Subunit: 423 residues, 3 copies
């Protein structure tokens, strides 16, 4: 799996013994915690040396072990497939350390892990929730209605956060117009909002990209009209101070201004945006997470997310496509701070629209593309064959902060394009 | 200015009461500080939970409030326009917290905020301070004179720093030659310099980009000649160790090697460079700031700056242009460490010279371009209509570290391109 | 001229106001002797420890720091150790020298000897790659990779446990033609603790081959895949934690040549940038160990070309001749940081943007952003001689081991660059 079940153990002294102590998740501060895993899950165990003796973790029946960690903070991670149901000791093999207390149980339970019933609204934008290509048609007046909504959202399994959104989801609505169109934008700020909200479209020309006309009090409405003068794939975002705050909380989306031709014909389109959340408590902490101002202004986030939540594009709203289809992903970074090294594991980009230019010729045969915050791009590729294709920021530590998505495509394991064994 | 006046409050216990405590700026460590703002200013208040009780901040007459912050370090920022002159209580609405001492005054004063008289040299390069297009002319020998000067500069309103510069400004002089030119470079290191200084031009071919010939002792002079073989927009920087130190302190600039044709004709040109400063004390601290080596080598800066100073391109040397003009910005990142997501709020780049290639066809209709440290680019756009256009690194937390500039363009508020209300 | 660096923190020790050494051969020593060889460039970083006013001065070099006042206030200075002998570094602030702020710089004749190595050399020579494939038809190509866990020389008195393809970092340079059918054998060495795998960015299907190559120690997996698209592709291990497998050294480049081949060039080089996340700071001697909290927080200690400090300066530098066109295949294993790749004293004639081998290259480029899991191609003509220096232009990474040399014999002064006026 590309979504391993992760457990962090720190060695130390508790309850009169030399033990493993759980870090984060369902095992925080528990001594020799039981690691509950479901049959067939991939298990990642991070061992961190707490007190400075020599330590490993060993599981005999999986021939799985860490390396020996010697100094304080010295770490070793290992993984395995929980293929066998039952109870298995994890223990330290260093002389006497197991006798001294360094031992817990891995419990592998049959059947699939249930989802933890959510407590807050699902704020994840489905990646299939966008308008399709506009017909060929004349330029015209297009009315767009945006509502700024502050609301608690399900950030992770067992963890919530107060999102600020366009229309109660992250990212906001995918806006699709034709170059030459006149956009009549209505911004309604919900009555229950504490904050003023606004919108800056990177595809609008004039003060604040519409921000200077859309500073909207709670329960109020602003209306701005602007001409879509330039074709492109544009991030829009709130532009009420603190703008970084409004952005991290989830107030970003994409505006496609289609060129006169339309974009190249493609079978299937997807809407994906990357952003960061800056919480007081580390990634994996249960309960209501809260915003950490010092982390926000210093660019030290805890969550890296596709479409608003951990599991957004894996559990709650994954991407589905069919072999033979050409796929387009509209990909933008709300941010507010980090440049994505956007990549799809198992695929190569046939076309990449450089710096989100829809008028310059796209680059061809590209593995990975840098997308800045307040930037967007378009990638397309042909699904020649089946598999689970995985969306990542290839700054891959961000896997361990919630940043991973699935493109699910039914087809055989083995064909002429990729198979096990030789010809 | 729409530039927000910012105040940070930490909740805690002081003077035997549960209070707000000021963080940084003119309010550092003051309990229930008076927040002085001028009529019509935009006010940003950052509330940070200090001790771990439930808190907000409320201002009744502005219907302005934070969210409730519960745990230690839990934060909520809110803003509003200081539209009414007078005195207004900010207070915590949690049961009993106001009675317990959580209350201060917002003072909204008539008239415009005065600027603090500066203490140190203005080290900000005006963005209009560059040579215009070279005529059509033959390749020739061009003598360039650079002087490396160490000097105290006005980093912010009430805060100074010891800059290292080419010719007493940040960025250094804009150097403009034609491909094929022979450059006769004289580097004079001022008598009063403590450090050796040098120059590496990204547009020069050979040892250290000229650095191996320009290691200049204080009071001394080096002369190097080099041929401008390749057209491009090149960052030059000091290359005396620690190079990152020489760069953060302000020793970076742009060399344009014009292609034979010249660059496309445009109405107005601008010179902008982004860099970082790594200070012991946080952004917003008054007095003489000093360099923090552990922050520099760990890439944890306090200041993100256009042309050397906070307010460089907003207060002291903003950009001015007229509706209808095509504008070119020569934009480079001295760094030394951070990639800029360069963007102008309210405009789209008609042309972007990707990776500073002046010979490859530019990209078209681009919102935002990544520029690496030791990289530069060219963007142009037509000012279709009026406004204050805002230069940013779209890693927008860097707003809160001094990184913002203004392009001022007078014209009506409402025209056919953007206006309030629906279409007519 | 890769500077010898010494860090001094001011403080109180042995009943005196002193300099205290930080890292290297001088960690925690009071008024440490700074041993330097004739003609070396010396960088001294002064950091204020206790909060009095301080500088460091060396009279016979007219070299000094600035005065540093507050706690953590810093000043670095450098000079060329041109004169052999012993020279006092001291604080010039009133009475501070008398109070104990004084040590000796010792400048010794002759070149610094190399530290005898303790662990295997894990640095890939940048010249160790297959040359251009002839013009030829698509065919079946068998590639053999072995995943080897082994102790390597991270720095000249510092070791680390590397995970590698074939015992070097980066892994083998794989070179095929578009249309080729790749028969990949992955052998995981018997002595490995971890499962290993490979994801090629140039393969189409589950995990870029990772889903077929999860290989137990002492075992072998075989996957076949068609190189459908030309490009310069990073490959890496894709066994969890993938970031862990990557930082430890499991990354390399696959060139899928376009039908034409790449433009003719005199000399080719293989360079990859990555990070290592150690418990102890950069410059610490002995067995370094991995710091998980630093890895997931993206706070590395080592920024490296081809696996080691001195990889492309001391142990395996780049060599070329004036007049030659040079191509560098440059990729970022990472796992986390985007390189601002630049060669000091050169300009890129061609840059293959985002590693596109089919789209026209950009021309006359100083510096190119390469993301982690990204690669590019740059070429340039060596018009003249010199030591050309490969850097990430996020230049604080110099102070974490990230620097390489391209050595090219030729005169100091020619018509392209020289000392006097013309
Ligand atoms: Cu143990
Ligand atoms: Cu908002
Ligand atoms: Cu924006
Ligand atoms: Cu309170
Ligand atoms: Cu300098
Ligand atoms: Cu440089
Ligand atoms: Cu002293
Ligand atoms: Cu591996
Ligand atoms: Cu990859």
């Amino acid at each position: 799996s590309h979504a391993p079940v992760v457990f962090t153990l720190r060695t130390g002294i508790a309850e009169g013994r030399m033990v493993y102590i759980g870090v984060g998740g369902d095992i925080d501060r528990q001594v020799n915690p039981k690691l509950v895993v479901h049959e067939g899950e991939t298990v990642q165990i991070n061992l961190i040396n707490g007190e400075g003796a020599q330590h490993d973790a060993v599981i005999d029946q999986y021939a799985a072990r860490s390396a020996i960690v010697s100094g304080k903070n010295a770490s070793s991670t290992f993984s395995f497939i929980a293929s066998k149901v039952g109870q298995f000791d994890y223990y330290c093999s260093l002389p006497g350390h197991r006798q001294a207390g360094m031992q817990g149980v891995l419990q592998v339970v049959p059947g699939n892990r249930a989802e933890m019933p959510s407590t807050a609204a699902d704020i994840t934008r489905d990646p299939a929730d966008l308008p399709g290509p506009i017909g060929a048609r004349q330029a015209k007046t297009v009315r767009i209605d945006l509502e700024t909504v502050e609301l608690k959202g399900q950030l992770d399994d067992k963890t919530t956060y107060t999102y600020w959104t366009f229309n109660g989801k992250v990212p906001g609505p995918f806006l699709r117009v034709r170059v030459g169109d006149t956009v009549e934008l209505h911004l309604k700020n919900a009555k229950d909002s504490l904050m003023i909200h606004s919108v800056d479209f990177h595809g609008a020309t004039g003060p604040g990209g519409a921000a200077a006309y859309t500073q909207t009090d709670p329960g109020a409405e602003t209306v701005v009209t602007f001409k879509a003068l330039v074709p492109g794939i544009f991030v829009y975002h709130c532009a009420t101070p603190s703008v970084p705050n409004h952005i991290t909380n989830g107030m970003y989306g994409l505006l496609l201004v289609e060129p006169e031709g339309g974009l190249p014909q493609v079978d299937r389109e997807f809407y994906v945006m990357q952003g960061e959340i800056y919480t007081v408590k580390p990634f994996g902490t249960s309960g209501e997470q809260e915003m950490d101002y010092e982390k926000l202004i210093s660019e030290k986030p805890e969550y890296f997310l596709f479409n608003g939540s951990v599991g957004a594009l894996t559990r709650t709203h994954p991407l589905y496509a069919n072999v033979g289809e050409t796929v387009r992903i509209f990909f933008g970074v709300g941010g507010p701070n980090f440049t994505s090294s956007f990549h799809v594991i198992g695929e190569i980009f046939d076309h990449v629209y450089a710096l989100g230019s829809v008028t310059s010729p796209p680059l061809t045969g590209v593995q990975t593309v840098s997308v800045p915050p307040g930037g967007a791009t378009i990638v397309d590729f042909k699904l020649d064959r089946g598999g689970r294709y995985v969306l990542v920021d290839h700054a891959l530590s961000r896997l361990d902060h919630g940043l991973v998505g699935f493109l699910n495509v039914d087809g055989p394991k083995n064909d002429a394009i990729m198979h096990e064994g030789p010809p």
